[PDB]
Amino acid sequence: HIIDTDVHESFASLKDLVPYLPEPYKSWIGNGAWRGFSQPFAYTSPGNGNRADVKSADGSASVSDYNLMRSQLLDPYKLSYAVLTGYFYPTGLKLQYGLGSALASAYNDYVLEHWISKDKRFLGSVQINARDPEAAAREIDRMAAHPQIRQVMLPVVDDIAYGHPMYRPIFAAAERNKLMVAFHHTTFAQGPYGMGLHYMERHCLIPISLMPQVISLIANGVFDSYPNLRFMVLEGGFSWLPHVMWRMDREYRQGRVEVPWIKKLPSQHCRERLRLSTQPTEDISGEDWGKLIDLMGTDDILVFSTDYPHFDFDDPNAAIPKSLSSGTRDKILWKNAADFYGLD
Amino acid sequence: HIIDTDVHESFASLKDLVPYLPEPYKSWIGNGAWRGFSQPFAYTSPGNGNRADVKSADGSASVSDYNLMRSQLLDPYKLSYAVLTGYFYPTGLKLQYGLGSALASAYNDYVLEHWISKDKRFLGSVQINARDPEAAAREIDRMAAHPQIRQVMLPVVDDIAYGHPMYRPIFAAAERNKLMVAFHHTTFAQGPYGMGLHYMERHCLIPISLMPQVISLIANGVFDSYPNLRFMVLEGGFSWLPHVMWRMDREYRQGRVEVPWIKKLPSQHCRERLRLSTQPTEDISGEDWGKLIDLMGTDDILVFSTDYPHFDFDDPNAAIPKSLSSGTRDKILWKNAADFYGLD
Ligand SMILES: [Fe+3]
Ligand SMILES: [Fe+3]
Ligand SMILES: [Fe+3]
Ligand SMILES: [Mg+2]
Ligand SMILES: [Mg+2]
């Protein structure tokens, strides 16, 4: 039993969405008025962000061929489930919201037709344009129909803290439709002072772009006001979570006159309803895993992911220390995710 | 012994700096053309950011009376040394660099005459305007000649990552003058998406404004370029340091080719020359302290501080768990700081 919570599929070409777009957007994209995203840095690994044996058609760090994924990932590792978390994140567009929203819908149509419908091991994400939270809510209502769709994907761009009350229609729609919430960094993710000055630094900063989302959701009452949502943060690490939990607890105890809508200790909200992917490895010893899980106070929090097809892919047979107890190992590799997605 | 690495003294009024200012800044400040900083949020603790029993003359979260510090902190605890870290950080001025630098200089004159020269337990910090690194370097040259001056303060404002090469004259001047480097957050410290929406969330975010300075300094070669410098990050916590060290090590291994100037593993750099204060408390058990020290791989890193006179003052007799070994406790309470400042 293995569930993979982070897999990056994509179209082969941006014009694959033209059949799904209404005019004028259809003509804008068909005639080349916008050519898509191009990450604002050079990858320093061979393979251009992917493993060396995976290329997408448009060059991005993704996979555009289901046959390649099935033959490299799904079948060889005998995955029970693989969560498609996308890669084309229209929330990265900072103007022309009507365009970003039409791209979000068109992308979800494309993935349902050429991915999710091809394999029962897939669990799908609703991609959205979070800059129009009401349109995003309507796309969530649209796509929650399909029983394999299980979460909404909230992309971490440069300028959005998702606990801002502007975004509440998104979480209300997610809850309404029995979908969970997932967070993933974009090519625009940054620290307080930018992405740094080199690729290696930009990549060190990815955890720093994501810890404020946990802090934001809790301080602004997102956990308290949608009790049926669980929240999964992918690819930001987990070794920092003891500190984020203890810190939030201290600030809650000292400052609760200011935040009376928080009705549990932040650490308790997190143990109950926050999940963090294990990928990428920090190359940590087995006894160090056990210590960190102790400090977290539970083994319910970690979910396995490979992050196929990216360069720092986590081999399922080597990422999770086998010295861990069997109950904990089963939780990390599949039970924690299974409970998150309401499976079995 | 006990050495306090974080104590916030200030002037009683900004006009106290007039006697040290040249024209036209002398007249600007004396006549009230600028009235100083005023933090952009309401404190939610009784005490306006301070202990309920300490009030500064200008209303800021600091202490302006040496007699009060001596009888509330220096004498009652038998402090061997106290590091005056300031509070008024002119780097927060984002224009009129000439004025900002004259204020740094004036402030340093004030502190030497009315604070440092009054008590041999004080270690002093050079306050600067980091927006003009060449002027900042001349002020470091000017003040380093006093023996109690032992470090330069690098304030963490909203928009400065100190690893950017523009800042190298500051590190060059520190190393040349045999001073160390300390970082402290300002009232302008923030995360990637601002300082949040509540005071409690702004306070949660402080460690997020400080972790990127460790990442910036290492990735951009500050550690390797200035091997005789030691770096202290204050008030950011320390439970996050294992993640930051592990992450940076991982990024280094997979991306050396981009950063050949980094001659040691980031974790080794940190174990040897990065220090972190223990304040404020996260309320964690002695057992858990020992596990975190395990995860950093040394007990050389932590330095005690009270952060007098702030609301989350750490009492020297209760902040450091007693189940830790006496060696570790001695290192934390004074020996790590003594070696950092070149004392005893
Ligand atoms: Fe991923
Ligand atoms: Fe990735
Ligand atoms: Fe403080
Ligand atoms: Mg000196
Ligand atoms: Mg305290």
Numbering used by the authors:
A (entry chain G), B (entry chain A): 2 to 345
Please give me the paper's original passages concerning this structure.
Dinuclear monooxygenases mediate challenging C–H bond oxidation reactions throughout nature. The protein components of AibH1H2 stem from a largely uncharacterized structural superfamily, PF04909, containing over 100,000 unique proteins that can individually function as either carboxylases, hydratases, hydrolases, or monooxygenases. Representatives of the latter enzyme class—collectively defined here as “amidohydrolase-related dinuclear oxygenases” (AROs)—include PtmU313 and AibH2,9,15 which employ dinuclear cofactors with different metal identities. Herein we utilize this “guilt by association” strategy to identify four candidate AROs that can each harbor redox-active dinuclear active sites. Each of the four candidate AROs can harbor redox-active diiron cofactors.
The genomic neighborhoods of candidate AROs stemming from Litorilinea aerophila (A0A540VG95, referred to as SfbO), Afipia carboxidovorans (B6JH23), Cytobacillus firmus (W7L2Y2), and Geobacillus strain Y412MC10 (D3EI84) intimate disparate physiological functions. Each of these proteins was fused to an N-terminal His6 tag, recombinantly expressed in Escherichia coli, and purified as soluble protein preparations. For initial studies, the expression medium was supplemented with additional FeII sources to ensure the formation of an intact dinuclear active site. Aerobic samples of these Fe2-metalated proteins were found to exhibit moderately intense UV/vis features centered near ∼350 nm, consistent with charge transfer bands classically associated with diferric FeIII–OHx–FeIII motifs. These features were diminished upon anaerobic addition of ∼1.2 equiv of sodium dithionite (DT) and returned following reexposure of these samples to air.
